[PDB]
C-alpha cells in the first residue's frame, strides 16, 4: 500500500550514458522519414526509463522466483517474468540476440 | 480512445450496394459474403473485403472512395466519434487523410469537405426529428422512424466478440450500415 | 556480439537495494531486454508523435509524446510515476 | 490367473499357481505385479459371488425379480453360487500367499474377515 | 400487473435467475469527464468511479468517458444513496477478491454470504418504483372516486383526508506489485480485451517473428493448469530455430442438444451436424458439436432434444491430446503475412487455423542435445549424468556414503570409452550429422552425500545447460524409477519423458563393469542411434515427442487408431484417465459382466501321454491375435481390420520402424494403459481368437494329427508310424503348404518347436527333445 | 466424539413389527439379500403409515378394472417394455403413456414411487395418472418408534437435552473443512495448491478437518500404472509424498482428527475389480497397506463412503460418488437436480443391484432412517449448493478445475454455516 510519496533524490540515480540512448534510436522505417534529432528532455526520460525498467525486471524476476521457492535467478526466471509485464515482443528478440551472444562469446 | 485502439470494421453502403472491410488482426475468422434484409424495401448485399493490416483496411477504404467518386458522404454521429477516429488512425499510419480524400476538419471540429459535403445524420435527430431526448440513439430512431427493430447488443462486449463470434458483429455492423 | 561490456552489467547489478544472487548471464539478458525496451519505446512513441504532425517536429519525438505514450499504454504504466519531475 | 504380458518381448501367456520369468526370453518382471494380479483375481471372484441369482431345486429358471423372496413353485430354498467354492479358492490364495512372500495379498485376506 | 412486478421485487427475485436480476435492477450511467476533475462533488457516478479506481486499479480512471454501471446496497445504515453505490463487477470477480473488497465498502466484516439478494437495497428500488407507481396509479385514482388499487403501497395525508362521506524504490516496488495485482485481477475478470491493448500497434519486434515463422514442426505437447485450462504450450520448430509458442485448443464434445438451449446457456456457435456417436448403450430403438467456454463444462442437466431419443452422455474428444491426432505433428497456419503476429502475441486459435501438411520428412535438422539420465539401485549408485553436445562435460552425482571410496577416477571409464569408441566410432560415423560424440570425452565427478542438495545441484546444472544455449537444444530425460518423480524438480523445457533403462543391476562392491561399460557410455551412443530411431518412429506415426515408444508402444497405435476413427464419423474416441470403456455410461455396472472370470482360452484332455509315433513339433504359433483380426463393436473391428491390412502392407520388403507396430498391436488390446479402446475389444478378440484356435486345431489335420495341449503358443501334431525323422524337410514344407490354405490369410509363422516321444499328464510332464 | 466406520458399529436388524436392533454375530447369505430388499421396501412403507390412508397389497387389487389406492413400489426393467413394479406379495406392470409426474423430484429405477391409475384387466397393465414418490419426515417422529437404544453407544435417552445443544454451541472455534471432490496427486499444480491450503490451515488449527482421501488420479488396474513402477508401488510413492508434505505442517499433527474416505479410485484392496462405481458400502483401506502416513500423526482414522461421525447430537454421512451423473442417466421419458430427492428418498443409492451393486452384509450404513440434520454430498457433476427448507443441511464440495481453481469448503459445526474459498 501507500507508504510515502515520490522522491527526486537523483544524486546516485543519474547514471547511464547519453551516447547509448541516441545510439539506440536508429529506426529506419523503409524511407518514410529523415530521423534527424531527439531533444534532451526525451533523452533524460529514456535514461530514467532504462534504469527504472532494469529495476522493474529485477523485482519481477525475484517476485516470481519466490513462488518456485528458488533463492536464485536465471534466464528462465527473467524471461518468465517478461510476460507478467506484458512484454513478449521483447522476449522473442532477446532470445535471438542471447543466442547470438552465446554463439559469439565462445571465440 | 483513438490512439491506443484500432478500427475493426468499416461497413459502408455505396448506393444500395453495401460493402464491408474488416481488419484481419483483431477478427479471427474471416467473414464471407452474407445478407441482411430486415424488410423487403431495404435490401442488404455485402461483399466482405478481408484486409490483413489496418493500413490495408484504410487504403482499400480510401481507394474505393477515390474510385467510386462520391458526391454525398453520410454517417450517424460523425464528427464527434466516427470521423476523428479515422483521422487519428490515418495520422498514426503513414498516409494522411487530407492528401487523398480532402477531409480536413473545420475550426469547431466538424469534418467538412470541398467536393462531397459530409452528411452527419445525428444533426437532424437532435435538430428536428421530434423524438424524445433519452431515446435519440440509432437503435431507437430506427425502431421509431423506420419500421423495424435492429440488432440490440451492448457495446461493452464488442471487443470479446471480435475474437469469439465475428459473424454476429458483422451482422450488427451491416445492420447499422443499412440503417444509416 | 560483444557490444555491451561487463562494465555496464556491473553498473546495473549494484543498483538494486534488495536483490538475490542472480547469474552472470541473467543480467546480460536484462541488459539486452533494456536495449530492446528503449528501442520499443522509441518505435512506439513515434506512433503517438505522428498524432501531432502539423510542424517540423513530426520526425522528432518529445516529452509530451513520451508522457502520453507512457500513460495510454498498459505495458508502460510503470513509468508514469517516474516521469514526474 | 490369466493373460500376463511381458515388458519388452511381448509374449502374452498365462501362468500357474504351482511352481517368476518369461517362457520366451528369461528375465524376472517384479513380484508386486503378480501380487496385484492375484488381488485382482480375488476381488473379481468376490464381486462375482456378490451378484448371485435366485436359484433353487425345482425353480431352476433364470432370476427375473429382486423384491420376490422365492418362486411360487414347490422347491426347497437354496442359493446359486456356494461359499465353500470361494473359501476353497481363498485357502488356495492363502497357500500361494504364504508359500511366497506376498504381504499385501495376505493383508487383504485379513481385511475381508 | 403492479402486484406481479411487486411480487417479483418482494420475494427478492427468487424465481428469477441472477443474470436477469443484475440486468434488471442495475442503472446504466456514464460520465463525461475524469475522476480527478470531479473533486468536491458527491454523486452515484463518482462513487462507482472511485470504487472502480481503488478496486480495479487506476488505469481506467485516467481517461474520461467511463461507463460506471451500478447497483445500490442496504447495509450502509443511514448513509446517502450517493455513497451507497456498488459496481456490477464485484459479483463477477472471484470469491476472496469480492469478499476482501466488499467488506471495505459494506463496512461489515461479520457477513458470511455473498448472495446478491442480501446485499442490495430492495427498499431503494422499492421506493423509486413506489414513487413511479404512486404517481401513475395512486395519484389520479383518488380524485376519480376509486380506492387505492395496490394495497402494498400506501398514500399519505394530502389525498387520504378528503375521503369523508536506495530510497523511493521500496514505494515504487510496492506500487508496481499492487498495480500488477489489479492488472491480473483485470485479466481475471475478462481474458481478451486487455490482451489486445499491447497488440493494437504492430511493432517491428512482432513483425520479425511473423516474417520468420513457416512450416512449424511441433516437438512437445504441454500443459497449463495454474491459469486458464485448454491452452497448450507448443515448442514448434522453425527453419533455423525453435520458437516457444502457445496454442488455444477447444473441447469438441458430441452432444446434439443445441436446439432449445439458446436462452438457457450462452450458445454462440450455431452448428447442427451429424453429432451422433455409436457406442453400445441401454435404451431401445437407438441401436449403434463444440463449446464456447473452454474453461468450465457448464452442460445442461435436463435432456429433451426432440430430435432423437436417448440421453447423450457427453462423449468427448481427448482434452489433452485433440491436436496431435485431429491436426498433425507438423503444424501449419495457412493464412496471410500479418495475422500470425497477433497469433504469436495472444495465443494461436487452432480451431479456425492450424491445418495439416505432408507428414513425411518431419525432422531433417542439425542442433544440440542435452542428456540427463539417472541410475538408482539398491546400492547407492545414483548416476545422474548430464551429457551435452556442445560442452562435452558430464556431471555424475554419486557416492552417497562418503567414508569409503568405491568410485573410479575416470581412468577405467576412459579406457573402456576408447575400446567402445573404436567399435562405436564406426557406428557413430554412420550417424554423425545428428549427434557429434566423435570428440574425445573428458569429464569430472561430483561425489555427494545428501539428496536434497543433490537435487539443488541438479537444478543448478540444468539451469547451467539452459543458460548455455537458451534454446536450439534437446533434453532427453531417461530416469527409470523416478520418471514421473523427476517432473517436480525441473520443467518448462522440451523433454522426452522415457523409461529407457529398466533398472540398474545389482552388483557387489569390488568392480564396476556392469554399471559403467554398457550402462553409461553405451547409452549415449545408443542415444544417438535412438534419436535416429525416434525420427523414423515419429515420421511414420506422426506424433511429437510425447510418447514412450520403447516401454509403451500403445500410444502410437492409439494416435493412429484415433486418426482412423476420425476418418469416419459414426464411432468416436473414448476416456483418458479412467480404465477406458467404449460404452453408454462410463460410470456403471456394465463392466462386471465384461470382467470375465479366469478367462479360459482352451483346456484339452483326450488323455494321450505316450505318443504313438516319433513325431516332431514345428507348430510354434505366434501372433494369433494379429492373425484373428486380419481374417475377420462392428465398425471398430472392421476399421481395425483395415488398419492391420494397411499395416501388414508396409511390413513387407521395406520397413525400419513400423514392424514393431504389429507386435505392439497384439500387446495393445489386453491392457488398460493403452489409449482410445480396451473395453469390449479384449473379450471380442479373445472369443474370435478362441474361434480361430478351434478353426486351426482341425483344418490342419490333413493327416492323422491329434492334440493334447492348446494354449495359443503351441499345440500337438501327430505323424504316421513309418518315416520317423529323415523326412523332416519335405514334411515341414508340405505341412506349411497345407496349413496356409484353410486359414485364408495365412499370416502366422511357425519356426523350430520340439518333440521326441512325449509323456503328458496335464502340466508336469515334458519328456522329449528333437532338434 | 469418535468416527463410526462402516463395520465398526452394531448391526441394525430392522424387523417388520418393531424396527429395533438385533444381535447378528464374515460372508453374507442370500437370506440377507432377500432381507435387504425387504428392508428397502418395508422401511419406506412407514413413510406413509406414520405420515397418513388405506394400506393394502396387490392381492386385494388383482381382479378389477378401476382403483383408488396409491401403489407404492420400486421401478424395474425385465424385458424391452416390461416396466415392473412391486410389493412383497407379487408384481404390477406399468405402461409408457399419459406421463404427467410431479416436477419437484427425480425418478430412477429403484426409487419407491406411489402411483395411481386404472388396472386394465385384459392382462395386468397399470396406468400412470399421478406419479409422486413419498417424502420423508422430521426428527420428532423418526426416533420415537425406535425406543431407547443407541447408534454407537453414547443405550440411554440422555440426548433429549438442550445442554448438549449448548455443548455444540459453546465451543465456536470448531472447524469442519470439507476440502473438495477427490483431488489428483499426480500433477504439480494440485500439489502446490494443497501446500498453500495446508499453509493457511496450518497457521490456524481446526478440530476435525474432513480431508480428501484416496487421491490417486488413475484407478488401480491389473497392469503397471507408471513406467517401471506398478499400480501399487506408484500409490505407495504418492502416500509417502503426501506424508512428507503433511509432516511440513506441525499443527495438524496434534489436535485435528484427519478422516480418510475413498471414492471410486480406491487402493489395491477394494478397487481393482471395478473401474467405475463398484460396491457402494466399502471397507476402509487399513494400516496393513498404508504405513508411512499413519506414523506422522496420532489422529488419522480411515473410514468408508456411507459413514456417520458422532457429535453426540449430530450425525454426518460424508458420501462421495457421481450421483448427479447417475440420476441424469435414467429419466422418465447443477443446482436443481439433487435438492429434490433427500426427503423423497430414504436410501443413499436408490438403484437395483444390476445397475449399482450393494454388498449384502452392510445396508444399514447407507440407509437414512435416523435422518441427519447436516449432510454432505460430495459430487463431481454438481455445484456448491446448500439448501435447508426441510431441516437437513446439505452441502456439496464441487471440484478443482473450473474457471477459478482450488475450490474447497469450510463448514462451521457450531454456527451451522458454510462458506467456500479460492486462492488465485
Ligand atoms: Zn519374455
Curated annotation (Swiss-Prot), chain A:
A GO cellular component entry from the record: nucleus
Entry keyword Metal-binding: no
Keyword set includes Nucleotide-binding: no
Gene Ontology biological process terms from the UniProt entry: chromatin remodeling; DNA damage response; DNA-templated DNA replication; error-prone translesion synthesis; heterochromatin formation; leading strand elongation; regulation of DNA double-strand break processing; regulation of DNA-templated transcription
GO molecular function: chromatin DNA binding; nucleosomal DNA binding; protein heterodimerization activity
Keywords carried by this UniProt record: DNA replication, Nucleus, Phosphoprotein, Transcription, Transcription regulation
Localisation per UniProt entry: Nucleus
Subunit note: DNA polymerase epsilon is a heterotetramer consisting of POL2, DPB2, DPB3 and DPB4. Component of the ISW2 complex, which at least consists of ISW2, ITC1, DLS1 and DPB4.
Note: In eukaryotes there are five DNA polymerases: alpha, beta, gamma, delta, and epsilon which are responsible for different reactions of DNA synthesis. Present with 2100 molecules/cell in log phase SD medium.
Protein name, entry field: DNA polymerase epsilon subunit D
Source organism: Saccharomyces cerevisiae (strain ATCC 204508 / S288c)
Part of the full-length chain shown: 18 to 124 of 196
Swiss-Prot record, chain B:
Disulfide bonds, paired cysteine numbers: none
Record localization: Nucleus
Function: Catalytic component of the DNA polymerase epsilon complex which participates in chromosomal DNA replication. Required during synthesis of the leading DNA strands at the replication fork, binds at/or near replication origins and moves along DNA with the replication fork. Has 3'-5' proofreading exonuclease activity that corrects errors arising during DNA replication.
General remark: In eukaryotes there are five DNA polymerases: alpha, beta, gamma, delta, and epsilon which are responsible for different reactions of DNA synthesis. Present with 1970 molecules/cell in log phase SD medium.
Family, as annotated: Belongs to the DNA polymerase type-B family.
Assembly notes: DNA polymerase epsilon is a heterotetramer consisting of POL2, DPB2, DPB3 and DPB4.
Domain text: The DNA polymerase activity domain resides in the N-terminal half of the protein, while the C-terminus is necessary for complexing subunits B and C.
Stated name of the protein: DNA polymerase epsilon catalytic subunit A
Organism from which the protein derives: Saccharomyces cerevisiae (strain ATCC 204508 / S288c)
Whole-protein coverage range: 302 to 481 of 2222
Swiss-Prot record, chain C:
Domain of life: Eukaryota
Record's subcellular location: Nucleus
Miscellaneous field: In eukaryotes there are five DNA polymerases: alpha, beta, gamma, delta, and epsilon which are responsible for different reactions of DNA synthesis.
Assembly, per entry: DNA polymerase epsilon is a heterotetramer consisting of POL2, DPB2, DPB3 and DPB4.
Biological function: As accessory component of the DNA polymerase epsilon (DNA polymerase II) participates in chromosomal DNA replication. It is required during synthesis of the leading and lagging DNA strands at the replication fork and binds at/or near replication origins and moves along DNA with the replication fork. It has 3'-5' proofreading exonuclease activity that correct errors arising during DNA replication. It is also involved in DNA synthesis during DNA repair.
Name of protein: DNA polymerase epsilon subunit C
Species for this entry: Saccharomyces cerevisiae (strain ATCC 204508 / S288c)
Gene: DPB3
Swiss-Prot record, chain F:
Gene name per UniProt: DPB2
Part of the intact protein present: 170 to 688 of 689
Description of post-translational modifications: Phosphorylated in a cell cycle dependent manner during late G1 phase. Phosphorylation may facilitate the interaction with POL2 or the activity of DNA polymerase II. Phosphorylation is independent of DNA replication but dependent upon CDC28 in vivo.
Role played: As accessory component of the DNA polymerase epsilon complex participates in chromosomal DNA replication. It is required during synthesis of the leading and lagging DNA strands at the replication fork and binds at/or near replication origins and moves along DNA with the replication fork. It has 3'-5' proofreading exonuclease activity that correct errors arising during DNA replication. It is also involved in DNA synthesis during DNA repair.
Molecular function GO labels: DNA binding
A GO BP entry: DNA-templated DNA replication maintenance of fidelity
Entry annotated with the keyword Cytoplasm: yes
Chief location of this protein within or outside the cell: cytoplasm
Phosphoserine PTM sites in chain numbering: 349
Name this polypeptide is given: DNA polymerase epsilon subunit B
GO cellular component terms listed in the entry, alphabetical order: cytoplasm; epsilon DNA polymerase complex; nuclear replication fork; nucleus
Organism this protein belongs to: Saccharomyces cerevisiae (strain ATCC 204508 / S288c) (Baker's yeast)
Family assignment from sequence similarity: Belongs to the DNA polymerase epsilon subunit B family.
Other notes: Present with 3110 +/- 251 molecules/cell in log phase SD medium. In eukaryotes there are five DNA polymerases: alpha, beta, gamma, delta, and epsilon which are responsible for different reactions of DNA synthesis.
TM regions (residue ranges): none
